[PDB]
Amino acid sequence: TSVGYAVGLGNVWRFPYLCYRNGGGAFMFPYFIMLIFCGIPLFFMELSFGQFASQGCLGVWRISPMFKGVGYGMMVVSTYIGIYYNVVICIAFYYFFSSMTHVLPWAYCNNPWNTHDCAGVLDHSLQRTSPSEEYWRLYVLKLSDDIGNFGEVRLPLLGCLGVSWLVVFLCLIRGTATFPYVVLTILFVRGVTLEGAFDGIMYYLTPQWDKILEAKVWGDAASQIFYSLGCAWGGLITMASYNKFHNNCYRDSVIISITNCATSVYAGFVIFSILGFMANHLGVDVSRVADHGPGLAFVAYPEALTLLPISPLWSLLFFFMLILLGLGTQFCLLETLVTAIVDEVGNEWILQKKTYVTLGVAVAGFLLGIPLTSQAGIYWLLLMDNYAASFSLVVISCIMCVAIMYIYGHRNYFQDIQMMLGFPPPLFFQICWRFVSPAIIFFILVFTVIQYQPITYNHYQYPGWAVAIGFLMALSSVLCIPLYAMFRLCRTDGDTLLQRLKNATKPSRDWGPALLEHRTGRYA
Template sequence: MEKTEKQSLPAATPGAYQERETWTRQMDFIMSCVGFAVGLGNVWRFPYLCYKNGGGVFLIPYLLIVFIGGIPIFFLEIALGQFMKAGSINVWNIAPLFKGLGYSSMVIVFFCNTYYIMVLAWGFYYLIHSFTANLPWASCDNPWNSPSCSEIFHQITCNNSYANGSFANSSWANVSISGNNSCTGLNDTRSPIIEFWENKVLNISSGLDEPGSMSWELTLCLMAVWIMVYFCVWKGVKSTGKIVYFTATFPYVVLIILFVRGVTLPGAYEGIMYYIKPNWSKLQEAQVWIDAGTQIFFSYAIGLGALTALGSYNRFNNDCYKDAFVLALINSGTSFFAGFVVFSILGFMAAEQGVDISQVAESGPGLAFIAYPKAVSLMPVAPLWAALFFFMLLMLGLDSQFVGVEGFVTGILDLFPASYNHKYKREIAVALCCGLCFIIDLSMVTQGGMYVFQLFDYYSASGMTLLWQAFWECVVVAWVYGADRFMDDVARMIGYRPFPWMKWCWAFITPCVCIVSALFYIFIIEKYLINVQTNMSFCCERLISPNICIHVYVLVGTSPARLHGDVTKVSRI
């Protein structure tokens, strides 16, 4: 096996201010990007959006925005890191006035690292409880069940909605309980799956103002996944590049197993047809196009700075242009394939309950922790399928999490070049990052923790935040540094000039897509979002919005004291 190289860059390279470790093999970079970008959203969000927005027709706006928004920014972030040999902050030395973009991405990825891991903690909790003869969420004879719990799953006569919440702009599950009784008699009936989630896992309180006590079981699960993350990242790309071979590929093995099992279940064909059946009229709805755009920005992990950090460990002459297209194909292909897995199982669940698939089709945690546990409880050998699913969920989230931590730590260490001479600088930095995030996460393992989680999700890394970040990245590279100039830099790295389509996207098309999507988000979508607590949410949105960093840095940089005698700092190398 090759030893990890230390690469000194040619003098012409802007990022040549320090030696930088590189990937042992280029495949390490590919697998790390796959692990980071291919995550939970590919499995639990894209299939639902595809079904909701016209089935196969949804692929038209989706693929269009992939080529005019997703790939151009994906390539831009990787190429910036590779050219500058720096993390998400120092890459913006190409335009120092806009270095706030780097700080903004650092804040975004820090918030993501903080709350995203809660999904892993919940998944780990479910995984542990899957190793039983009888799944604990399949019956009503547990200490956490209420007298109104019912195990009846047949033709719908009454509907009980779980909760008014969302995750990644996707609604929570509407879970229906039914029987041969009248609606009057079933008004208070609750599913054992719902009660396991609400009463056992979350032990949820009535609101954000009632934090309640901590769950020590969830705390231990949270600690366990943070320890996993630490030991995946602590040695840098030498360890990360090896671990991702398992964490990035094993979910595909499980997806294939679940697909084979799913298509053999009764009702699977109807479920798959619901997923892909085209509804051409949907193309006339603006919401379909916005859903396509926001899904791409989420699933491609744009604006977080982690792709820049991963690219910074590439060899200077690596063909990152080709890599961007390969990774985009893997990402979008995974999303589409996952839909067949999800809807074959949802079709089975609908057939077993005698309901329409629209009544069981969910996204987000509603799929992972309510709909899918309900589905496996109806299967033979239910614990096996539950364990496989939640282990896949853990692997999907784990590599996204530790690469996110890698991106944050890389940016921090780059701010202090002298720290690279310290023997244990990385181990200490990773420990501090994980420890700080763990302390913040303790607020999410309380009875009111779900409300804290939702606040982070709504506002710290929302669609609006990522759209604004992507808009400024394109504007700065194309108009401040210069699109042609950056294309020349890329040509120096990869040996040829990319197709002009890239610079046209950076300069005109992608910023327009971001602005139109952002305006739609502000004036239409946000009006319908159901907040945890309106006043508290409004304040938190303004206080923790990461994009503030961009504007503050520009204001400070353009102050008379800073500009006096040095107006050349707006754009330089």
């Protein structure tokens, strides 16, 4: 049809380092399996569910009011996600402003912010370092040893974060595509004909059959397959309201998922190409050429731009594109939260004064993002990526999927699609929804708990209190489900622990098509 949009920050910065962190090519096959049997079939459901009634992340839960806690917990995940994008976005603002010189600062192994073991590509001891790494570590952030020393605050980064939180606010209060693909193609053309790039593509292929029997690989695969698509992420169910009741959500689900996966894999090729040259010209293997840190795009992409002629223009376009991409994501991600919180109160004094709540949500993010921009920035930003976005979105999505088709009913939802789409859901979709995906999610979740929780599960050797804080934050996103369930069970008429459950999970009196002339049969 046309461009499938997508191509967010979860396709240029997240996947390239997640794949390297999960051992490289051992992550691709589980990713394909989890996208085929827990991806697309977890997207058509959300599209149909939103197209049912024109609502957002909240309000749609009129099927089982006791389960409305899923919606409230869904925002909590978005809050922990829509706060650490700007820190990454702010770093992009520190590179756009830095690329204002005839020669790029991260392109010469002679600058004062280097060491004696620095290596070069243009024109001792052990563990040779590429000139790009000794810019992200010793000059941008000045990272300390660990969380043990908080350090001072990087003034340039703190200043750039203010603009990151300001431009979004100004653009929000006042009231495109095919560009990433051409830049990615230009970056792909270079760095592959260079000698040594062949080794960097093989490591992106030939998956290791020995390592596929683990838990971390599939755990990350489920998170990535749900994070990029938008399942329980916010900003996906809400826009389903702005869709015609007779729109082919099946075609959109088929096209968007494939396009997003193709873009992510293409970014994988682009990123892993430079790693081969790094390994070749440094003298180490591909698996240990870099570090398993949160920033790999800022370590691999800049060197590719250096090799290209007339590099400053390319850098200016690339980082400008990245900034616009991040702002485009954050715009919707924050606007949906503001709309939900405004509609939640349902009052008048907090209705016409929407500017104040917009300032309040924006000011809160600015203040709470201060400690991320400091001498211990990498570790704190990286802590909120393992125990904040992983193993919570998948759990919430699985619980929602079970609740829709095992309490409301499997015949009802299947019958409804006939009244929306001409042809019934395919027999593949019926089997995958009912048994396959919930069983896979349950098996992964139980296997990550029964086994594989030793000290070696700590891939990063975090201290006990820090991992305790991360575990506490992880629970908060998922622990909202039973609390609201009990809260609503209190209000229900207290007969016995059999009738209260039925009296609190039945559909409400306004569950049906959003508009009239569509409620004529069962939903009339």
